[PDB]
Every structure is written in C-alpha cells, then in structure tokens.
Amino acid sequence: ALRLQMLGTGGAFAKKYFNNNALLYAGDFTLLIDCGITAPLALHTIGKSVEEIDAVLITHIHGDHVGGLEELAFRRKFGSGRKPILYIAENLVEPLWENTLKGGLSQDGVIHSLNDVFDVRLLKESEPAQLAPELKVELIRTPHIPGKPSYSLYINDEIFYSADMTFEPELLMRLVRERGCRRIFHEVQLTGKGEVHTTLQELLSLPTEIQSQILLKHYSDDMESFRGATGNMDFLRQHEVYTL
Amino acid sequence: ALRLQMLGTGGAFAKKYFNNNALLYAGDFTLLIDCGITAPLALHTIGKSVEEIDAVLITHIHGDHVGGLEELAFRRKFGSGRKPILYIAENLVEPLWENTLKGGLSQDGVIHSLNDVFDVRLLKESEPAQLAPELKVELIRTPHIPGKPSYSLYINDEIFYSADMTFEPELLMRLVRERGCRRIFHEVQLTGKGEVHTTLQELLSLPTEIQSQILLKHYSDDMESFRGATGNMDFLRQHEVYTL
Ligand SMILES: [Zn+2]
Ligand SMILES: [Zn+2]
Ligand SMILES: [Zn+2]
Ligand SMILES: [Zn+2]
Numbered sequence A, B: 001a002l003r004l005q006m007l008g009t010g011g012a013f014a015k016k017y018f019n020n021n022a023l024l025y026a027g028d029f030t031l032l033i034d035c036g037i038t039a040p041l042a043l044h045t046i047g048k049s050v051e052e053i054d055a056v057l058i059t060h061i062h063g064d065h066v067g068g069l070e071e072l073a074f075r076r077k078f079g080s081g082r083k084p085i086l087y088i089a090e091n092l093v094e095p096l097w098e099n100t101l102k103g104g105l106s107q108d109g110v111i112h113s114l115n116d117v118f119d120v121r122l123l124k125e126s127e128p129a130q131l132a133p134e135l136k137v138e139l140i141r142t143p144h145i146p147g148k149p150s151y152s153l154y155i156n157d158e159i160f161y162s163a164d165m166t167f168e169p170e171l172l173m174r175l176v177r178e179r180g181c182r183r184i185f186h187e188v189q190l191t192g193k194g195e196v197h198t199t200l201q202e203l204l205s206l207p208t209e210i211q212s213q214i215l216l217k218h219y220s221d222d223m224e225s226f227r228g229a230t231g232n233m234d235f236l237r238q239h240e241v242y243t244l
Helices: A039-045 A069-078 A090-105 A169-178 A200-204 B039-045 B069-078 B090-105 B169-178 B200-204
Strands: A003-008 A021-026 A029-033 A055-057 A085-089 A119-123 A129-132 A135-141 A151-155 A159-161 A183-187 A214-217 A241-243 B003-008 B021-026 B029-033 B055-057 B085-089 B119-123 B129-132 B135-141 B151-155 B159-161 B183-187 B214-217 B241-243
Touching (some): A029 A129, A069 A090, A085 A090, A090 B090, A200 A214, B029 B129, B069 B090
Parallel strands (some): B029 B055, B085 B119
Antiparallel strands (some): A003 A021, A129 A135, B151 B159
C-alpha cells in the first residue's frame, strides 16, 4: 500500500514547519515531491539518507520547491554517484536548469546540464506514468503564478495532491464526480488575500462532502490558531506517516 | 566597534551547523555576508527579523551562499517593501540573476531583474568601499571553483574573511606582512582532499604566528572530533557575538 510522509507542511516562509515537500513510499521505491531549501535539513531530521531517494518530482519553480536540489545533486554526485531520477514537465526543464540550478551547479569540465546530475524523465500533462508497481502519477496543469507553468498531481487514479495553486473548486468537484477521487491534499493560505494560493475561507465554501476528503498543507506558523475551525477538513501533521 | 555573529558555521552539507553566513554589526547598520538555503531558518533561530538586514554581500554562487535570497527578497517585498542593498561583484550580477534567482523570482508584471528586489551596488575587486562609518570592505579575488569568480573580503584594513577558497598561504602571509592583517576567519575542510576548499592539514602547515590569528569556519559535522587539535587556531562558535 502507498504511504505518504511530509518532510514539511509549511508555506514558503513558515519556521515552525519545513517547506511543503512530500515523501511517497511504494514498496522499496521512494519518491520525493519537491525539494525546497529546507528539504536537506528535513531529511536529516527524520533520519533519511539522500541515498534512499529514488526519484524527485518537481511541481513548479520556487525556492521552497527546488531550492534544495543543488545540495541533493552534489551529495549524490560525491556519494554513490547514482543520479536521482527527476520527473518534470518538459516546459519546466529549461527554466529549472538555465534560470535556477545552473548558476551553482555548473562547472566547466564537470557539470554542463541537468542530465549531468539527474536522470531526467519528462512527464506530459494528462499522460499518466507508472513510476513503480503501486505508484501511478498524472500531472494536471493548475494555476499558481501567472505566466509560469505549475502542476498538481493525480495519484493512483484517486488521490489529488494540489501542490501550490489558487482556488479551483470545479476541478476538485470534477475529480470527485468523474475520476473517482477519494483523498485530497490541499494547500491553504490561512490569512490574507488569496492571490497565488487558496485561502481557508475559499476552502470552507466547498460542499461538506468535498471537505471531508481534504487534509491541509503548505500552511503558515499560525496553523494552531485554526485547529478545530476547518469544518470537516484537518491539517496534515509534519513527519507523520499516512497509509495512502 | 565592529561585531560579528555567524548565522551558521558549517560547510555546505553540515546539519549540526547552518550554512556559513555572517552578520556584521557596525552601529545600527547590519550586513549579511552570504545568504544560504539555511539563512532564513538561522535568522529565525536567533530572533532576527529580515527587516533588520540593511545590506547583503554575496561572495560567490553556491546554494549555501545564495539559496536563501529568494525568501529574503520576497519577504522584504511583501513586508516593508524596502529593497535590501546587495553588494556584489559585477561579474557575478548576471549569473546570480540569470542562472540562479530568475527562475523562482521572475514574474511578468512584477519582477524582471535583480533591481526589482534589491538595491544593487557593484563592488570592484581591490577597490575598498565604505559601507558604514565603521565598516570598510574590499573584495579580493580568490580561487574556489575553476572558471567561476569567487571572492574573499578584507575588512577595516585588518580582518581577512576567507569565505570559500583553496589554500593560499602566500596571500595570508602577504596580508599579515604588508597590509596590517590582525584577524583571519578561514574556511576549513576537515577531511578529504582539498579540491575546492582548504584542508586542516594545509592550515596546520602555516607558521605559528599566522595560525594564532585564525578562527575556523565552514566546517563539517565532525568538528568536535578536532577540538584541541588545531594548533594555535580555534573553531568559530555558531551564533556567538564576537567583538571585531
Ligand atoms: Zn510553495
Ligand atoms: Zn510556489
Ligand atoms: Zn560554501
Ligand atoms: Zn562555494
């Protein structure tokens, strides 16, 4: 059975919680979903070696989702030398390398492209990929920063992992209505206007049945002020291991 | 009098110590020297608001020195809106923006260049700059990664801050002999071959008088195994406030 453990559950600036990055365990296969500036410290905190990461999947380009990749890449290069598999949309490959990782990683005789530190495997929007015997993943293009591609994930045909996105209640409802969706992991912006994130006020306007599927992530340091005030939804606990 | 507090004293992969980033205090003026993936968490740990950072100086492009700049930039943009001053060599401006920060920070109507999030002030190699009444800083070009510009700092005409560099004992000796150098903060690679860092074995070959000036930084998680074995040198303590 698939297992999920969040390395962190926090929004980009939270300090009680690490960056919102997920570990999925399918048998011996370990997928890291996003790898922010705190992911190395978070891995250390739960006692997980970078050698145990079989693949990394990148949902969009922001420091709390890609800022730890340089450390992961170098440590694997200097350790066993095994390049982690990197799952990513084609339209994020060039920005991730050319505008994010190249500055620190590149070195004349040594590292020239993403392929020198990762085993790059492109995912196509709405084309499911069997990552491992019990782990199927489908990218869904969703909005976050205008003009920048960002993605959510549909897992094993029944788990929606929102990653970072603005409010899309028809998407949620359609996944539950047409695609068998049973569990939803949704980011939430607890205070302020939802310009590039989904607010708690927005999620509370969802129908009761959709709220019952939702565990909340990517949240700020005031999360404890809201415990018990999220209707039928609840907050993911950082480092807890969930089955499914 | 000038004061120094390391946000972290660790090498790039250390987990007992944060990334090797320095705070300098000259009266009310606060300079951050480098801003790695751990710098936001380290600032939080010592209770320092990002609003108190008056300027940031970048010695070279690596995640443990620039990987926290995206979070600093965004938090200042969304907070008081005051752009931090960024001191940097001209030949690092384009790689820092185009190949490191642009991917996550850029946004069509909003952020197009480094100047949209920083007040960029170029430093010239070997041209001292008075940052504040009691803080003069001079970039010295030193080797670290072949083909990449990286810099050390000469402060108030008498403090050498090595930042990241390979072994340059004639430089040290010449600064002590010709330029009045009284204190040296030097990176150290405790184990392994010194390909892009200075090893402890190398520093131990320095003359006794030069060792007496040196406090060690950028060190790995096995630092405590070496305490008392560094001749007349000693290890910097993370978060201690030093006068000078
Ligand atoms: Zn995020
Ligand atoms: Zn984001
Ligand atoms: Zn370094
Ligand atoms: Zn470096």
